[PDB]
């Protein structure tokens, strides 16, 4: 148990660390999912990739511009696409005077010019490329394969898991941005960042999910109006000023070059990038997890959007419950603590 759920920070040995589905569930046990946030330094000798220069010359097919538009800590955001561009030519574009990271003093004095600076020169994110950028051979939190119930389903029982646990890559710059959101269907994701500068995130514990919906709710009405699950849409942000006015708990945290963060089943959490980095993630499961996959809001709105089947989830793992699932008295209410 972890009451105060302030997001924990691990630095596994190299034997504690081989084994990511052991890890993770060591994580849960000291609590980790409260936070609905986690992060994991890997020990010091292990290298997903022994050399990055290569990755200068892939190509982002579709580069997004981030339109931000708001006022006072309360924002909408929408994608205005780019000519396709390589890493090498992102890169500089991300280094370059109008793109580039402001000078700061520390964590806290960026994180309030990114707050400032938002409605000014739209950043460019390199986001969504389908890709791992791990060696052949790298067995240990290799994104692209984690062997979680997900993996299972798909493969011994011919399920489609939907691309949910294939790996992206994101190449950010200076403010780029991910609104608050959970991942589809719930489920947990993995975020390693291979190279760069750093990216901060910000997150609200599962047991208080329903808080920032609810503010969320009232601040976009509109978007509420025409949506159940509106902030799947990933174009809301809502800065941490705002949550503190409005007691919406929640906790702030730094990812360096070569750090794990892992978000739980229905942890909110949104963020920015430092300036130039690549991060790596994807969607991931525990059996649980099952029961968020069950009670998710999807959204009602879209036709595309994400949506798993939960029928072979709970007959395989859950099966003195199936039935009675199916028969729509499969009624609770989740202890996001247990
Ligand atoms: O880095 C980003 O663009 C945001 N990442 C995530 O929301 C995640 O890895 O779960
Ligand atoms: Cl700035
Ligand atoms: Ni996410
Ligand atoms: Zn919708």
């Not at 931000?68 to 574009?93: D, P, W």
């Not at 708990?249 to 892992?262: H, L, N, S, V, Y």
């Not at 978000?263 to 991931?284: I, K, R």
Request: proline letters at 5%; aromatic letters at 14%.
């Amino acid at each position: 148990l972890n009451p105060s759920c302030k997001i924990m920070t691990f630095r596994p040995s190299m034997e504690e660390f081989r084994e990511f589905n052991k890890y993770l569930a060591y994580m849960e046990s000291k609590g980790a999912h409260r936070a609905g946030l986690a992060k994991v330094i890997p020990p010091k000798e292990w290298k997903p990739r022994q050399c990055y220069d290569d990755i200068d010359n892939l190509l982002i097919p579709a580069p997004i511009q981030q339109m931000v538009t708001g006022q006072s800590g309360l924002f909408t955001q929408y994608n205005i696409q780019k000519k396709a561009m390589t890493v090498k030519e992102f890169r500089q574009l991300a280094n370059s005077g109008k793109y580039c990271t402001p000078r700061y003093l520390d964590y806290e004095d960026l994180e309030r010019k990114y707050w400032k600076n938002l409605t000014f020169v739209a950043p460019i994110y390199g986001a969504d490329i389908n890709g791992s950028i791990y060696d052949e051979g790298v067995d240990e939190w290799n994104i692209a394969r984690l062997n979680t119930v997900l993996d299972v389903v798909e493969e011994e029982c011919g399920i489609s898991i939907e691309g949910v646990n294939t790996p992206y890559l994101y190449f950010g710059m200076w403010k780029t941005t991910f609104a608050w959101h959970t991942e589809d269907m719930d489920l947990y994701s993995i975020n390693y960042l291979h190279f760069g500068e750093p990216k901060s995130w910000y997150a609200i514990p599962p047991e208080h999910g329903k808080r920032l919906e609810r503010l969320a709710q009232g601040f976009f009405p509109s978007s509420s109006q025409g949506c159940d699950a509106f902030l799947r849409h990933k174009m809301t942000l809502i800065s941490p000023s705002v949550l503190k006015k409005y007691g919406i708990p929640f906790d702030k945290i730094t990812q360096e070059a070569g750090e794990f963060m892992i978000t739980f089943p229905y942890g909110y959490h949104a963020g920015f990038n430092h300036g130039f980095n690549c991060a790596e993630s994807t969607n991931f499961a525990t059996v649980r997890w099952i029961d968020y996959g069950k009670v998710a809001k999807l959204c009602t709105c879209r036709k595309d959007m994400v949506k798993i089947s939960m029928d072979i989830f709970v007959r395989k793992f859950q099966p003195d419950r199936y039935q009675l699932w199916k028969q729509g008295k499969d009624i609770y209410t989740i202890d996001h603590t247990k």
